[PDB]
Design a binder for this molecule. Structure first.
Ligand SMILES: *[C@@H]1O[C@H](CO)[C@@H](O[C@@H]2O[C@H](CO)[C@@H](O[C@@H]3O[C@H](CO)[C@@H](O)[C@H](O[C@H]4O[C@H](CO)[C@@H](O)[C@H](O)[C@@H]4O)[C@@H]3O)[C@H](O)[C@H]2NC(C)=O)[C@H](O)[C@H]1NC(C)=O
Ligand SMILES: *[C@@H]1O[C@H](CO)[C@@H](O[C@@H]2O[C@H](CO)[C@@H](O[C@@H]3O[C@H](CO)[C@@H](O)[C@H](O)[C@@H]3O)[C@H](O)[C@H]2NC(C)=O)[C@H](O)[C@H]1NC(C)=O
Ligand SMILES: *[C@@H]1O[C@H](CO)[C@@H](O[C@@H]2O[C@H](CO)[C@@H](O[C@@H]3O[C@H](CO)[C@@H](O)[C@H](O)[C@@H]3O)[C@H](O)[C@H]2NC(C)=O)[C@H](O)[C@H]1NC(C)=O
Ligand SMILES: *[C@@H]1O[C@H](CO)[C@@H](O[C@@H]2O[C@H](CO)[C@@H](O)[C@H](O)[C@H]2NC(C)=O)[C@H](O)[C@H]1NC(C)=O
Ligand SMILES: *[C@@H]1O[C@H](CO)[C@@H](O[C@@H]2O[C@H](CO)[C@@H](O)[C@H](O)[C@H]2NC(C)=O)[C@H](O)[C@H]1NC(C)=O
Ligand SMILES: CCCCc1nc2c(N)nc3ccccc3c2o1
Ligand SMILES: CCCCc1nc2c(N)nc3ccccc3c2o1
Ligand SMILES: *[C@@H]1O[C@H](CO)[C@@H](O)[C@H](O)[C@H]1NC(C)=O
Ligand SMILES: *[C@@H]1O[C@H](CO)[C@@H](O)[C@H](O)[C@H]1NC(C)=O
Ligand SMILES: *[C@@H]1O[C@H](CO)[C@@H](O)[C@H](O)[C@H]1NC(C)=O
Ligand SMILES: *[C@@H]1O[C@H](CO)[C@@H](O)[C@H](O)[C@H]1NC(C)=O
Ligand SMILES: *[C@@H]1O[C@H](CO)[C@@H](O)[C@H](O)[C@H]1NC(C)=O
Ligand SMILES: *[C@@H]1O[C@H](CO)[C@@H](O)[C@H](O)[C@H]1NC(C)=O
Ligand SMILES: *[C@@H]1O[C@H](CO)[C@@H](O)[C@H](O)[C@H]1NC(C)=O
Ligand SMILES: *[C@@H]1O[C@H](CO)[C@@H](O)[C@H](O)[C@H]1NC(C)=O
Ligand SMILES: *[C@@H]1O[C@H](CO)[C@@H](O)[C@H](O)[C@H]1NC(C)=O
Ligand SMILES: *[C@@H]1O[C@H](CO)[C@@H](O)[C@H](O)[C@H]1NC(C)=O
Ligand SMILES: *[C@@H]1O[C@H](CO)[C@@H](O)[C@H](O)[C@H]1NC(C)=O
Lengths: 751, 754
């Protein structure tokens, strides 16, 4: 059995999602324990749907049906599944909690439905529930009803550890919550008041999310309903008195102006405090609560700006010096003109403060030397400011109030201390710009509209930069000594610096590249490179990877010009080369033969190639991956094994191949992965299948070929049957084009 | 009938068969006998014989350029029998020789871009009627080729020849015995180092001479370039042009000139256009005796005469520029200088007709702007690509274009049409301060594109030039945080804010587009590629005057998210709008109420290049003026069967690149207004009779169907017969209206099935 329609996988999971399925297939293996049927067109679940699949411990029916209208699940449809632990039913337009769910359930997700009634009948039998998600049923301008929570509905769920009720109209915290709760999410629930009773008994709670209740609505990116008068949430003095185990508290966008220090009296473990989108400028200056948090590691005070206010200075209370455990401080969107060394004195003896984030404050100048006086900053994040020369659209499973991606690309941060000055106005780097900074290893200058001629001295005060990002500037590469002060540079990103490269009449100089002794990775992408001055060749003894996408090799290698015929030959250590998006119609033979013999990976995808000289792979004895996707190729050589014994992956997707030559599936013993996706194949011929021996072939992609499903396809179908070790992904997309009665169906589905 | 494979055009005198770029392997035997011009360019034709055009004696013009695409073999005399052949284009055919036995009727012959190295009497000297002969670009750069041999006197018998183009061939000397009927002589890039008194002594009718690129200036060349020994100058004898009294055009670009002999111009009283780009003329520009000899000159191009590595404070223009009384345009790109002062341009200031001054690409850091007012009448002040800051076919080189510069207008004609133009694009005007625009003329057309401007415009910045009518602010970083922005510009008709994403992208900063309603005369607004998905307080765009809104490249998918009502009327307040562009907004579906709030005034609505799966046809009932609906590049499956119930205005419906697999019976019944229906690149297997059928006949004039996977069984018969009974409906590109199935038909046109 080659399984269909699902792909089976044993790290036993049937991946069956996004396959245009109309019903639960009756072709699922009986050894399957986890079934992913998300994103199909399934409209009915009955007690017949999964009979003879009782090993199932997990079912995902999210996002069904898509497109061309709700999911209809009968009473007790799942009841017979004795082992069902986890049921995901998100985005199914369910009007109610389905009835008669199995008591074995420990995890149930009903996120993004139309469920306005939470009943004993739905839920109170489900004694084994540990995590229950009912979020995003009624929010924003959706037409929906206030949520009715049957009194005591949650009381019998004495194993429940996580309950998520966010983005529903609740009005108050429900009573009779089980004391087993660890995590309680009540974001955006229209609760204006927290009483002493609401969480009095939840002694095991480690996370509480009360965000977005009484929101700050000015300039909201969503329909936002403030409390009367834009008032603050109202939280009783003793509301958190028993929450001794709280580690995470989210009070983002609760319109707070005042924080009651006493709220933290009994929270000796509190680790992450989110206070973004409030009105806390005054508390930041004078916060008594900061005195109550000596184990706090992450404090987010972002977007507490006063509307219309652009103060000279940020005002940080001396009490910040009590945050002895603080690791990250987020101060985006406070809005201020100038950062002086004195303004941050309270932060300067915190031993573990690693990250300071001052993104999006419209800061016009910074006294940079202040950063050295900190104990140990490793991320100095200043992106999106005004620093100039010195002289359903919300993911319900993510954080709603900010992105959670790293501030600094991990590959750069991995080198050491990081200074991110991206998206500023440092248009010219002058002699003292970088004076008195720490030993920066990772420097981001992307998008500073820098148009200068770097000349070998600009980075002299931080000469150990290992990863330099200069993307999206207007750099004028007119000096052979550029960047050469950076002896230890390993990664250099010059992508999107077209501005001068595109003008023929100005001089262009890339000779500095050869100076670096440790340069491993160079990205020259999207620079429109088509002409250089005097020195035509790129050279480096160390470089391993060159990204040359989005340039004009079609010009450089024009048949009437010899000058660039060795452009990459001097990159003597290169193993990875990217020549995508260079508008190539053909590569002269001599040009191809002058690519480095060291290559293991060569991409030439998304050009316009009409021919490819296969014989020339004889000069590339280490070549493992050749990527020719997105071209106009028609001809495959019929003696590939004469030209390579190294090639493992050949990517030929989105070309115009109509004929596979004799024994091509078995031509190259080393070939593991052949991608023939989206070409013009009508069949695969017997001679194409002829093998002298066996082959290393593990994966063959064929989806989007216009197959002719006559009896001519028989041979390949029988081949598929007898080579079950060759994976063919996406069989639902390996489709008959002709004739009319077969059109649209998988080739596997053919009598 | 309906012609195939070519498209025919009944033009004037002419009837033209457009037959190019059709993958043809043979000259087709199906060309109409009334055809006078045949364009076969860009096909896979390999052989021309005396049978190729047998049935086609009316042919006056044949284009065989660029054949075969992926050399062309022409038998001796293949064209001889074509008694009326006037024009033969044989460019880019890898010909090794001039074809033999060409008809004597020829008046126009192009052999541009071949491998022809011998120009013989036998090829050419019988062709007595030739008026234009093009032999350019046969041996140039690092092509493998040989020096051109021109048989002595080969051109002498061509006594009606007016244009001869020999550029981009290795010639070494001007050929002798040229016919005196010559008007235009092109000898660019021909490796001629010396011009003698004899070379053009008899060419008394010459109006153009091109000697560019002989002894070229090669520093930083964008092509393989071979200087004369020592990088010496072309050597032109004092009397080389003494008989050239009719010359209007002289191109001496890239001839390594340092010194210009005034006497060269003594007998050239009509000279109008002088190209001197890519020389070493900084010294002549400061002194230039030759400027005294050119009082009828209108265009002078001195671009890229920079001294290598030199960055002087000032440009030095001789006082002799004041003698160029007829001068209209002065091009001074690439001289390279830091500052332009008012004194530096005094010699130019009383020239009555000097309309255009071009200072592009000089790395200029400051300009004393007041100087431009003291000119008599500048209309184009071109300062693009400097350092101005706040005030305190396959061919690399198109052989049919100018090689030394682009020929496009300096200023977009739509902007220039309004009046005086100041182009400050691609500079460093990052902040517009209070006096930036002091002392300027009455600018009507203002380009500030790509100045990395990040400021909050606030209603006073353009106070000193308040009659700007066309404002280009594209590709900046503008922070639209003030409702009075640009409102000082009362007469503004066209405003381009494209590519100012920078702050629109950030949810947490405020965004304000309210200023738009203030303009009384605003007609065209372009907000493209701004990533607009959230505004502050005022969610709606309003204008009583605006006729055209370009909103492509924003996030209407977000603005019109089903859980948000706030932007449901975003465009309704554009009460005068007729053209709306919603392309590239990632839309999967448009809420019905949102669609219905688009202005009732629309005549043209584009929603192409989204991801639409649904389109509610019934809503075209509220758009009684709608003439063009463009839905190309979406994922639509369903067409309504009762389109005539919902519109009587629609003339063009563009549905290309969708997933339509069925034309409903009877789509098009009673929809009389529709002229142009584009169903190319969909998933059609056939068209049924009743799908096209109409009782009251229709205005249908164009139906596109190429790139559909047609099933060429007998099920296609009905459409084929329909095609034959509606010859007034054009179906273009019939070679691309192809059978997908079954195997024996696959690849063939549907019109080609018995
Ligand atoms: C208020 O603040 C609290 C933190 O104090 C915040 O709690 C965090 O919420 C996010 C939002 O869901 C949780 O993040 C998810 O965690 C689960 C559990 O481990 C993951 O499965 C999620 O996985 C990601 O990748 C998956 C791949 O399968 C995807 O399926 C999915 O999209 C996700 O990308 C995801 O990381 C997070 O764990 C909690 N924090 C804690 C400690 O529990 C809350 O969101 C904030 N409130 C608002 C309204 O933003
Ligand atoms: C310029 O090119 C460089 C080099 O290719 C780009 O950086 C590289 O980007 C890739 C992915 O595009 C990173 O690879 C990824 O790494 C992750 C985690 O290790 C892995 O999960 C992915 O499958 C993939 O391997 C690669 O590490 C990264 N390299 C470096 C040195 O940072 C860069 O993105 C390009 N610049 C621009 C503007 O595109
Ligand atoms: C911003 O949007 C405006 C308005 O659509 C764009 O300018 C307009 O560009 C089109 C070309 O796409 C011009 O129409 C063309 O005019 C010529 C000459 O008459 C005609 O030959 C073409 O078939 C077509 O009609 C239109 O005139 C022009 N309107 C102006 C300038 O007012 C503008 O280009 C967009 N900006 C960017 C950066 O895309
Ligand atoms: C340098 O700063 C830029 C600009 O902030 C970072 O670019 C963003 O990075 C991610 C790639 O992971 C994208 O999803 C965003 O679109 C980028 N934004 C823009 C405007 O480009 C970049 O990654 C930073 N570089 C490093 C090494 O951290
Ligand atoms: C203002 O200047 C910009 C930049 O010079 C112009 O953009 C050019 O437009 C031409 C013709 O439309 C394009 O082919 C070029 O690619 C553009 N150049 C660049 C760098 O983008 C724009 O046309 C000018 N605006 C006006 C009104 O003339
Ligand atoms: C018209 C430009 C001639 C050659 C040239 N290339 C450059 C170049 N790339 N940068 C320059 C910066 C300042 C001054 C002159 C520059 C220059 O000159
Ligand atoms: C954190 C952003 C808060 C709201 C805001 N939007 C903008 C905005 N768009 N521009 C600003 C310019 C200067 C100072 C504050 C600005 C501002 O503040
Ligand atoms: C700082 O971090 C280190 C471990 O990463 C730790 O041992 C020490 O306890 C922390 N200091 C404080 C003051 O919390
Ligand atoms: C690069 O710049 C430095 C001055 O910054 C200069 O000394 C050196 O000559 C420059 N290199 C070249 C080739 O001009
Ligand atoms: C850069 O490399 C070149 C040539 O290899 C050498 O002449 C130059 O001095 C080098 N300079 C530095 C600072 O690395
Ligand atoms: C070549 O690359 C390898 C892997 O990065 C590295 O070990 C070696 O140091 C490089 N060689 C040279 C000569 O720099
Ligand atoms: C492939 O390469 C060499 C030239 O280096 C040549 O001998 C062989 O004919 C080539 N194939 C094609 C189609 O050019
Ligand atoms: C073509 O030329 C040859 C003379 O070589 C003659 O035999 C033949 O009939 C000619 N064909 C036509 C169609 O004129
Ligand atoms: C200036 O141009 C006008 C209009 O073309 C023309 O009549 C006049 O002769 C020109 N003046 C000079 C000095 O050439
Ligand atoms: C716009 O900016 C100007 C600065 O001149 C300021 O006076 C005005 O109040 C601002 N208007 C708004 C609505 O912010
Ligand atoms: C702009 O538009 C509205 C017109 O209703 C008005 O309130 C506002 O004051 C106008 N502003 C200026 C600066 O003209
Ligand atoms: C409506 O647009 C046209 C431009 O075609 C103009 O004549 C008319 O004046 C505009 N109406 C108003 C009220 O601005
Ligand atoms: C189209 O919108 C119309 C308004 O005429 C509404 O009656 C109809 O329900 C719509 N169809 C769909 C599928 O939304």
């Amino acid at each position: 059995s080659r399984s269909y329609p699902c792909d089976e996988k044993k790290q036993v999971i049937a991946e069956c999602s996004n396959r245009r399925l109309q019903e639960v297939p009756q072709t699922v293996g009986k050894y399957v324990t986890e079934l992913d049927l998300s994103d199909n067109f399934i409209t009915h679940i009955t007690n017949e749907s999964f009979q003879g699949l009782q090993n199932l411990t997990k079912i995902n029916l999210n996002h069904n049906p898509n497109v061309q209208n709700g999911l209809n699940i009968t009473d007790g449809a799942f009841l017979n599944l004795k082992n069902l632990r986890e049921l995901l039913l998100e985005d199914n337009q369910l009007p109610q909690i389905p009835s008669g769910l199995p008591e074995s359930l420990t995890e149930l997700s009903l996120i993004q439905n139309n469920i306005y009634n939470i009943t004993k009948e739905g839920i109170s039998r489900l004694i084994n529930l540990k995590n229950l998600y009912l979020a995003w049923n009624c929010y924003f301008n959706k037409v929906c009803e206030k949520t009715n929570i049957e009194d005591g509905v949650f009381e019998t769920l004495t194993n429940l550890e996580l309950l998520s009720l966010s983005f529903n109209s609740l009005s108050h915290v429900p009573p009779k919550l089980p004391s087993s709760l660890r995590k309680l999410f009540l974001s955006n629930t229209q609760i204006k008041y927290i009483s002493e009773e609401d969480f009095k008994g939840l002694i095991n709670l480690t996370l509480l999310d009360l965000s977005g209740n009484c929101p700050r609505c000015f300039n909201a990116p969503f329909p936002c309903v403030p409390c009367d008068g834009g008032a603050s949430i109202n939280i009783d003095r003793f509301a958190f008195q028993n929450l001794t185990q709280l580690r995470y508290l989210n009070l983002s966008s609760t319109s707070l102006r005042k924080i009651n220090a006493a709220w933290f009296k009994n929270m000796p473990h509190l680790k992450v405090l989110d206070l973004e989108f409030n009105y806390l400028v005054g508390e930041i200056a004078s916060g008594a609560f900061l005195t109550m948090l000596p184990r706090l590691e992450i404090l987010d005070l972002s977007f507490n700006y006063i509307k219309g206010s652009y103060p000279q200075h940020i005002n940080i209370s001396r009490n910040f010096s009590k945050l002895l455990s603080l690791r990250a401080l987020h101060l985006r969107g406070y809005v201020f003109q100038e950062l002086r060394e004195d303004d941050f004195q309270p932060l300067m003896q915190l031993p573990n403060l690693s990250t300071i984030n001052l993104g999006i404050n419209f800061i016009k100048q910074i006294d940079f030397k202040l950063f050295q006086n900190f104990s140990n900053l490793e991320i100095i994040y200043l992106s999106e400011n005004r620093i100039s020369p010195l002289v359903f659209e919300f993911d319900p499973h993510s954080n709603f109030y900010h992105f959670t991606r790293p501030l600094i690309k991990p590959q750069c941060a991995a080198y050491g201390k990081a200074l991110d000055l991206s998206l500023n106005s440092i248009f010219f780097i002058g002699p003292n710009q970088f004076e008195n900074l720490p030993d920066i290893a990772c420097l981001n200058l992307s998008a500073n509209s820098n148009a200068q001629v770097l000349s070998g001295t600009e980075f002299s005060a931080i000469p150990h930069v290992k990863y330099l990002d200069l993307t999206n500037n207007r750099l004028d590469f007119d000096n052979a000594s550029a960047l050469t002060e950076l002896s230890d540079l390993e990664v250099l990103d010059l992508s999107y610096n077209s501005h001068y490269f595109r003008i023929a009449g100005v001089t262009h100089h890339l000779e500095f590249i050869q100076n670096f002794t440790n340069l491993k990775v160079l990205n020259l992408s999207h620079n429109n490179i088509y002409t250089l001055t005097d020195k035509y060749n790129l050279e480096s003894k160390s470089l391993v990877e060159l990204v040359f996408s989005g340039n004009r090799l079609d010009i450089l290698w024009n048949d009437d010009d010899n000058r660039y015929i060795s452009i990459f030959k001097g990159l003597k250590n290169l193993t990875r080369l990217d020549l995508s998006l260079n508008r190539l119609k053909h590569i002269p033979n001599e040009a191809f033969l002058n690519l480095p013999a060291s290559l293991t990976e060569l991409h030439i995808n998304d050009n316009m190639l009409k021919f490819f000289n296969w014989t020339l792979l004889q000069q590339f004895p280490r070549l493992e991956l050749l990527d020719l996707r997105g071209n106009k190729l028609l001809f495959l050589t019929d003696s590939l094994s004469d030209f390579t014994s190294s090639l493992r992956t050949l990517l030929l997707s989105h070309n115009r191949i109509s004929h596979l030559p004799s024994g091509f599936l078995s031509e190259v013993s080393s070939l593991k992965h052949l991608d023939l996706s989206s070409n013009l194949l009508k069949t695969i011929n017997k001679s194409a299948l002829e093998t002298k021996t066996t082959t290393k072939l593990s994966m063959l992609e064929l989806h989007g070929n216009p197959f002719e499903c006559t009896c001519d396809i028989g041979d390949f179908r029988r081949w598929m049957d007898e080579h079950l070790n060759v994976k063919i992904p996406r069989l639902v997309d390996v489709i008959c084009a002709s004739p009319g009665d077969q059109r649209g169906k998988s080739i596997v589905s053919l009598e």
